[PDB]
Design a protein around this ligand. Sequence first.
Ligand SMILES: [Br-]
Ligand SMILES: [Br-]
Length: 268
Amino acid sequence: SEKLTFKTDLEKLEREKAAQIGVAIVDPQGEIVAGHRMAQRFAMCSTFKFPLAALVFERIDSGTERGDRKLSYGPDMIVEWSPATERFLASGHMTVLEAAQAAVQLSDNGATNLLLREIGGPAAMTQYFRKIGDSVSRLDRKEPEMSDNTPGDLRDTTTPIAMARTVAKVLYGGALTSTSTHTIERWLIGNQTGDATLRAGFPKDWVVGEKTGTCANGGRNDIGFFKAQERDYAVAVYTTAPKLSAVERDELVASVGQVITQLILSTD
Ligand SMILES: [Br-]
Ligand SMILES: [Br-]
């Protein structure tokens, strides 16, 4: 069956690359299509910036936040990998929406932390996962320490299945207004950081949007959505490959994209 070949193809990559691959594919209602180590915890790394932007839009939707509110900051908000926050530093602020878009499409850490400083910190991020029916994902720290991915640490983790269901809830399951949903969907399609990861392994006519993440200790992740054969899906991929190079980890995730494609093409 297509599900056995999916598993054995992922196990081959896992053996040969000395890696662990967690994957969940769900339909728009969160129904499982396929998975592998789907309920093992993995560090979210930057993937949590997608749900963080969803949280931001829920606050906009409810009138407790305004997308063009200016958020002021100084040099101390600049951390590793803050390309847009660095550019906007002299101006002295980014708006809520500028920071959210940079968090999503550039994985900007300063922008992420600026939003966390506005929405009530890691506790409030965790509270939003619970609100949207995810009892698993948890943010405990800001960037970059939340990406430390110390082996066995449950802080700052999710599972493939919980996060795939979270993605589905946000894009398909009515969590946000239609306006807010469409905005975040387009940001994911226009993501700047995902060209060499999952989307590299999908057919070119599939509509795909995703958010990547990289952790210390070999974490490399990609979550998002794809539309194939008039069928919509949500997908979460988390991998741990301590001995691969960064480029090899990209290749690993693209290879997982290929394995997913083969399952979907085989699926009645
Ligand atoms: Br599992
Ligand atoms: Br303002």
